[PDB]
Amino acid sequence: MNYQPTPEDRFTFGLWTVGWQGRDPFGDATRRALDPVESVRRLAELGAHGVTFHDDDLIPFGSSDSEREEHVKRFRQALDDTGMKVPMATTNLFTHPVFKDGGFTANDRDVRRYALRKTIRNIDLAVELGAETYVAWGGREGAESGGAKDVRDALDRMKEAFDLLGEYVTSQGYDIRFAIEPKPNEPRGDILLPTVGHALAFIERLERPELYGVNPEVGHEQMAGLNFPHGIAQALWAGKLFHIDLNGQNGIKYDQDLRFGAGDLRAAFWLVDLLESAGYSGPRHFDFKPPRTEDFDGVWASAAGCMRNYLILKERAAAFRADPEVQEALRASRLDELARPTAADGLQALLDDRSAFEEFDVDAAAARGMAFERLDQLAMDHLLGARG
Amino acid sequence: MNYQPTPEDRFTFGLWTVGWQGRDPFGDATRRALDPVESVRRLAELGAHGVTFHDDDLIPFGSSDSEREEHVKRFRQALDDTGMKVPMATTNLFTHPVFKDGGFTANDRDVRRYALRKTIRNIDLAVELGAETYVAWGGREGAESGGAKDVRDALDRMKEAFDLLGEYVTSQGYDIRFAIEPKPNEPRGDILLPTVGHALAFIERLERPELYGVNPEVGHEQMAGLNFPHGIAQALWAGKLFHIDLNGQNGIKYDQDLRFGAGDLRAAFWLVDLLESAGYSGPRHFDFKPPRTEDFDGVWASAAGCMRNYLILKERAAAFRADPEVQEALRASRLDELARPTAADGLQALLDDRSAFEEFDVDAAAARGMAFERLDQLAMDHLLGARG
Amino acid sequence: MNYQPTPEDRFTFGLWTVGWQGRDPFGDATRRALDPVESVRRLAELGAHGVTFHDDDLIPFGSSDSEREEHVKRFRQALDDTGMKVPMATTNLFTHPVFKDGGFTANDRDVRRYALRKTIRNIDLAVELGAETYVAWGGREGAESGGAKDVRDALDRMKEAFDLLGEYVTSQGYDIRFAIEPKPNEPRGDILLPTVGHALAFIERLERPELYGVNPEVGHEQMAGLNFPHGIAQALWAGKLFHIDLNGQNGIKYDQDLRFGAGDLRAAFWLVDLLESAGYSGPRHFDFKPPRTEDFDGVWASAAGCMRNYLILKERAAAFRADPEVQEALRASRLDELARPTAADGLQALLDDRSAFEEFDVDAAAARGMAFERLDQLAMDHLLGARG
Amino acid sequence: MNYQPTPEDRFTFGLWTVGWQGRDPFGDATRRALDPVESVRRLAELGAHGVTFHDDDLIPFGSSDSEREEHVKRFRQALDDTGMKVPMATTNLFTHPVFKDGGFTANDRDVRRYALRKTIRNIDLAVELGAETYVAWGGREGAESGGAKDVRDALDRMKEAFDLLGEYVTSQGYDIRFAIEPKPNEPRGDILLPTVGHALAFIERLERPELYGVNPEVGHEQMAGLNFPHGIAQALWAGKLFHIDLNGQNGIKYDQDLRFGAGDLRAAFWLVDLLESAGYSGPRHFDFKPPRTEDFDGVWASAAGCMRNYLILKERAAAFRADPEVQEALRASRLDELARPTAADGLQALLDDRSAFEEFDVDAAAARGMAFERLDQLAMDHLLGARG
Ligand SMILES: OC[C@@H](O)[C@@H](O)[C@H](O)[C@@H](O)CO
Ligand SMILES: OC[C@@H](O)[C@@H](O)[C@H](O)[C@@H](O)CO
Ligand SMILES: OC[C@@H](O)[C@@H](O)[C@H](O)[C@@H](O)CO
Ligand SMILES: OC[C@@H](O)[C@@H](O)[C@H](O)[C@@H](O)CO
Ligand code: NI
Ligand code: NI
Ligand code: NI
Ligand code: NI
Ligand code: NI
Ligand code: NI
Ligand code: NI
Ligand code: NI
Ligand code: NI
Ligand code: NI
Ligand code: NI
Ligand code: NI
């Protein structure tokens, strides 16, 4: 009846999303560049809550300290005129040829130091604009060949970089946290910290782990054929879901960055169900690319579609959970038992419990059906709005 | 000239590998069952160091405490007669219908308790036989549909199970460590802790993390299209590579379990180079399946091939690293710089270093070629034994 | 409001689908065997139109000519009592160990001859029961290693087999056509004629091409990451879609055989839209497996779900095409122009047409947006029943 | 001992390969543009036989008929000075924004006509330069969404385009054949005629099928997880392998275009074995991209590596086939029987042959091992130069 977004929904977009000119590895741009100020105004009209940026999206690379000031001021004025917020910022450590072998893990030491300085500079700006999260996507960290990169040394350099950024943030007294964005490949043959799991594990080896979280992207985990909602559940379980990138992907292939809802629709439904059920309160950020076949009217239609699909799925997931028939099916499938401790009675009690082994009727238990197909069809009926 | 394995190479095989009867989802067995005693004798003849087992491989499910004693005694006699060792053992929590929805994370609480008791029983046996590592492969932990499993609750149950096993081991004063074996899918649609990264991250949330490591399998990470050597490098970096399963896999599809060397040959080369360079001293365990097209002579030929390929790759990786031309190429590609700290001088020094940003010549640095293709061709020449 | 199937919908199921006992490569069966007579009765109750079978599903392998007669008679009586039809039949050339290296392309000549005799025998039975289509799924035709199979010779043997079957059918004056079912892998490492394209190309080299078509399966093309609806469109374009296997698959991994609607939901929508738009009049056959987690109530629920999902998607696809707003969007995206000939005026006229090259305004044409995102969102809104 | 290529080896390179500037979807170019004349000279020095080009690689888009003449003349002079040949040419129907929705299958009719005129113009030039094959890679033919393209209409337009090109070639009396290059995806979400199979099937529906063949690329079939050598075997079987694109790819992900030999090494070995065994006499064309990490010395090293790897594999494949031990193993695995007709005796004789069914000992046949693992290890030993 009404799927109109309002800033309360916390939907955000990166400047580079709706601003993508359409240049791909086999073709030239199909759209002219958008001035960040226009993007803010257009996104505000659509019901967006805010925007995000890479340093290089806002301030052209090589800009003087004076041109830099002018670009920030214009942007700040657009934010003030629209009420749009800037909850997240990041660094571009992948476009310029100097980062061809990476930023934080480039083999060249001078490049690694430059990467850190470029990042620190943008952290100051991020804080100025009010960002609460600083994302790091090591797109160029990795290799196409085995001897080019000693991964153990690379991880030492990656840890060193993140520890220094942590030391900087704490010495300046900033209220900002970091979020690592994993991706398995593209543009490098293999990228370091390829999935949410690898990123979470790496974080536990940092000096101040409390300052780091993860920024998973639906399409990235799907490029490894992984179950996105499951990955998000593990991140939440560890208390590390600081931010999230929403989009669509059609299986294992190049990173498509389709609008949210496109790609794996059922996974989108399960993702929304999880985010809403867990009470995730961070931004619902869309990192997508309106296909190069579109003109500007098509880009705004695509962006609007991102928000619309999230809202439709939110309604359907809510109806699913509130349905008494579904609550009954969840009990029939023993989801209630899954939430109860296996042995709150303790180890010794379990060892002495003859009902757990000596007298356990394995055949009777094995004959119990899980009733998962009925439950899944109810989920399907809810998603399609076909409940009879 | 000589690629003959000896027990010093630490090559091991699971009883279920060479003993696989050939039953697959579309066909009946093509080979008769092997008596574990024959397998030990045959493997000892081939130069193997030891064997591994699931409880159910050694003692048929449902066996009485007396039949259990006889099976262990026969096995023990074969080990004594051959000098074969048993460095690792594991539990079968996947074959019996009772584990259709998992063991440690089954929705049914009584099944979870049974899973733990079955495991504890085999841990005692493992220690008796001298195993240093106890592997856990949660093959049935997961789902085919989204509502069937609440992943956060499932992870709570998985943690609970592993913590209890840790409490047991420490209360008995055993000298045994655990290793979690990840797998992304099959037999479940999606399996919990799908990759080495997810497993490493989970371990950091256990009560006694020092007791747990990972047991990665080449084919499993490859089923997610991940770079196995990179994953192993991260495990070593974290000091968690307790054991390893070697085999072959041809890309993203069902788990093939080809003999080691088959599948991705170059990845096999890089894996061996890494294991030997890092000084991994654990067993080189083969978890493979001789294809159902083979008779018994073909199974022993396949097992022998596993060891032969490891030894050939070991020689080639050693020649590669010792080659002065390669050492020169490694420096040309700046691998030496990758190993040097980015900023041992500290944060403040980096911030004040004008050569790192203000006066950094980005164009000059960007113009430096990495020389990675030459290095990779030298690696190729070494692998193929074609160095001119 | 009403998604109840009736025999008019032409929904069919293989005996081996609802009859799958749940045995997978890592576990024993979780359900007892179903008597084909019970399956027919249960499927008739659900609204099914008919069933299909492999010879070995109906007559246990090794059965005497007398036991064979009894099995057929019982089955025939169930068909008569329910009004169920048998539109398709096939041969099991994959379960028995003798077919470990294939049937029609086994390296052993005696096995190939046996494969043909086994097939011919079942063709006679198929005709007797009224089947119009005879499917061939060469599940064991292929290899795990490169030297094991010379593919050119294998294709010669595959052609030889199919030509002989064609000669048999025509000499007996039967009214039956063949349909080749492609699959890229599993149970073999690589299967011959891996996709719909390969199968269509092979057919054009047979002696009587008019007798052969294809029987694509949604999950099989998806195991190669291919777009199923596109593949079906090519089959229809060539006039070769004789039959179709419907199910669900979650990307590139083992063949899941989920119920139809599960897996890639959007692809299911586009498939139904295409089948209904093209006027496909053959059976809507479900080749799926109710997950081993289910008891018998779960299998019937899963089968019912197959039909329900098809009917829901059919309604949504129909609403999409009938929507004036959609018809308007289709014109805005120039689908009408795609259907008009590029050069009905002829080659010479095109060469002399200056508006086609010399005076063609490429920049103006390039600036036209395709309006594909708006069209796709309308499709999404229709699928979810969210049209405002 | 000597892997130096000479023009007799027929190795060719596209101008766009060694000339790739390194621009990818996330970064700017890392190398300056190469003048085609320099590329010809450098490639001739390396032992190459010839080069190939897209119209737009040789003549900048938008060039006047006079600038066009100058570019061709300079190129012609470089060919004369080096003795380099031009065996293949193709059209660029993917870079310019006008082709954003395709060339031959664009929804806009005026674009389709323009695509044909652009192609015809380059065919004339190709003939002038002596090309025997004209390749067509429909990189933009396809879609990202289901409603954007009616595939049946698209195939009608694709057929119409190719038929017109055939009519043109025959009316001009040219001695040139066409080769369709399939690719499953990238840059479009899904590309029409996604694999070698689909392309072969489509060709059989053209007016003059004898004029069309296929130009498969190793990395493209691998992006669908298909077995390249198997696909090539089917193309040869149909007498349609007119040309071939050689490169390397690491599984299912974006198109990497690694140098030949890199990626799947074993598949490269089996490919060379097949091409040399079948007597393929066309060019060995490399369609690869030297990684953006390299400077110009790295690009020439990468190109040289393509040829070197082919020559090493050629030697190893030859040694494998000539090895008496291997010839013996091939007979043990019954490859000789695979080449013998299944029933040269005819249908009736087969039906009356009791040894084929009634008296066939299935158990005895089933017990015969295929000896495939031994054969494969011999292949492995040969590839690695480790034959004892
Ligand atoms: O694949 C590109 C990646 O998703 C990128 O867009 C990051 O999200 C961004 O650079 C960090 O915010
Ligand atoms: O895919 C099967 C898995 O690899 C299994 O064989 C484990 O390795 C074993 O159960 C634990 O040791
Ligand atoms: O992957 C199994 C395949 O789908 C099989 O079930 C065929 O459809 C059947 O044997 C022919 O009808
Ligand atoms: O993926 C790009 C494709 O391989 C292209 O390079 C073609 O080969 C060429 O355009 C035709 O010759
Ligand atoms: Ni992304
Ligand atoms: Ni992405
Ligand atoms: Ni992102
Ligand atoms: Ni395994
Ligand atoms: Ni495995
Ligand atoms: Ni394993
Ligand atoms: Ni199937
Ligand atoms: Ni299937
Ligand atoms: Ni099927
Ligand atoms: Ni290509
Ligand atoms: Ni390519
Ligand atoms: Ni190509």
Largest sheet of chain A: 8 strands, parallel
Q: Helix and strand string of chain A, N-terminal first?
A: EHHEHHEHEEHEEHEHHEHEHHHHHH
Query: How many structural domains are formed by the residues of chain A?
Result: 1
- What assembly state would you assign to the polypeptide chains in this entry? homotetramer
Name the helicity range of chain A: 40-55%
Question: Hetero groups bound?
Answer: sorbitol, nickel (II) ion
Class per helix and strand makeup of chain A = alpha/beta
Tell me, what is the CATH class of chain A? Alpha Beta
User: Which fold does the CATH topology of chain A refer to?
Assistant: TIM Barrel
| Most residues in contact, chain pair and counts | A-B, 107 and 107 residues
Tally of helical runs of chain A: 16
| Rg value of chain A | 23 Å
Distance between the termini of chain A: 19 Å
Which strand order does the major sheet of chain A show? 8-6-4-3-2-1-10-9
- Shape assignment of chain A: globular
CATH architecture of chain A: Alpha-Beta Barrel
